[PDB]
């Protein structure tokens, strides 16, 4: 008596299944990203915020921890689409063009 | 005609209603200055002594561009979006409280009120240590924009010539915008004290090196479209505690012609500079304004309560709470058994707490043309900030941006150059207030809200 | 000898994205399957029914310029940051370079 | 009035998070504290919800009954911020004062 | 979670909703409560209690 | 010297009431909500079940 999962099946499925689709579109696009330093090593120099040369080579993995806008924010919540709490809102990013 | 448009004459009012309210604001420091501890982040003990005009630069979010637009309610494209707050209850912190300020080198000729003896020695520097209060006062000013105080100065000796050292200048009156933390005038000087007294030997120390204003409600009431301040609330009282005559050279002279002379000191009468000591009077809690709904309806403002750029300038005064606090800290880790003050380093700070609370109506405004454009002529800026035909902007700049910093030695332009529209009041200090989430519609769940609902 | 030499790297990127909203009609068994899948999102939405209780009375300006309480204030709890925040990213709010 | 007791607020000393000299008789670091109130809790008089002793290394400089005391002040704000009133359904206050 | 989690969503509401009001009327009241002692201190006399 | 001085403090007090008891028909989500406010009550009603 703590999870608590009713019958039947109790086995995972794809999202899309229950995904309520929208037509909703957004574009989103990263203003320009660059970051710089010394490859071979970091030059610490103390002095001290960090005041430094970060070790910037590039054979280090490229990971964007990407924060996305809450779609449950709007609006005008009254809106067509929405009933909270019948519905909650969710992103799917669907598209990316990686520059 | 200049003819004020007057909000409502085109602001489409709505059914939109909202809550906002600020959880606690808190800060402490000293009754005068900042006691620096070499700086910088922070390492100073500031001043904290609220007898300063209180300006919350109160930020709300863009309702225009909330996001999602079925726009069912409205086409921003025509009806761009704006807040109006309607109802407010600012929740006020603390017990009530009170305190004293003084000056050791406060001059005095004598306590000419009704001195027990009337001695009058003619020696300088007898300026002693006296402390005092002020006029019991509560005021608030609410507006879309900041406020103006007015205050004096030793004005221009705009006579062609120049003149004597220590001679009285002509005195010129000055208007200035009031800003957060601006020092209040308290009963003594919407002017530059510091200028005024060459001596620094008079009044309570706190104002010695000061300048204050008194708020220009009257001009501010004379407001261009009933904006700036579109709401204002005010309450003040006082009496005179004790009388003196100051010591000092009479920079002018008395007419003889006022008296039959006497002998000596009576042949030659002493100073004519008569000076009282203030006091605000008793307090009862009863007279505190704070903590109730001020629902507003009609207002003075011909802007009936809206803020473009989401800024409301909450401007306030309260005399009900004055103290910076005393720590007697032993110099000794021992606590001696014979107490000497000397075994103690003793310290002073005041502390202040706050809540703003709100009931809004956002209202939507359909773009009308020889009127929008009038608004541009009211001020375009908002309108820009609601924009329209051609932004314009600039791609190469727009791309670029955030790259640098993840270091501090690698590239060391280190943000020499800015990008703002600019708020001029950048040069001014606010208490920076934002609330873009105190946003609620949980009126029910909002103290004020409950009232408000009830207010319906 | 007359020369001191230095070695540096550079990397630049712009990704462009297209989103689609979905609604979740929050059906209970799913939801709860999802709770049981993981709650937290759901938690992050619902359930405002008792108990979603809370704190209050906070915010304190210059803490400490000097002599305010220093405060090891430092209040956050889990999740996702736990662990993610033990981890390097180029942290990305893309949230508002979001264009309709 | 409440079905459950209530909270006062009162003062303490903060932290000075390092050997910030820690001078003997230094300036204290300054902290604000809430506490639940009990039957018979000592009050503000119009003076100070805190510990006294905390402040005064003298025991020589406050009204003696409260000298070596500690008090609170009602957290009305909080209790107005109560989730439902079980601390405060109702609240009532009346105070008057002047400085002699 | 625990003891009772949802269904369904929702928020927080006044009680009054579910309060079945009654006709129940009571008087209740405590007659005189009294306790006296010394201002500054407790006077110990180690009786005690 | 002939006289010893003493300091004593005093209190007298009265509560008066009117109740109207209220009934709440337990329904489960409510109960959970109530539980989620405080179950203890419910136990203390023993809302049950065992």
In words, what does this structure look like?
The structure is cut from a larger assembly and holds six copies of chain A. Chain A has 99 residues and is mainly beta. In chain A, 0% of the residues lie in helices and 28% in strands. The first copy, chain A, has no helices and five strands. Chain A has strands at 19-21, 26-29, 33-37, 64-67, 87-98. Chains in contact: A-B, A-C, A-E, B-C, B-D, B-E, C-D, C-E, C-F, D-E, E-F. Chains A and C meet through strand 1, strand 2, strand 3, strand 4 and strand 5 of A and strand 1, strand 2, helix 1, strand 3 and strand 4 of C. Strand 4 (64-67) of chain A pairs parallel with strand 3 of chain C, so a sheet runs across the interface.
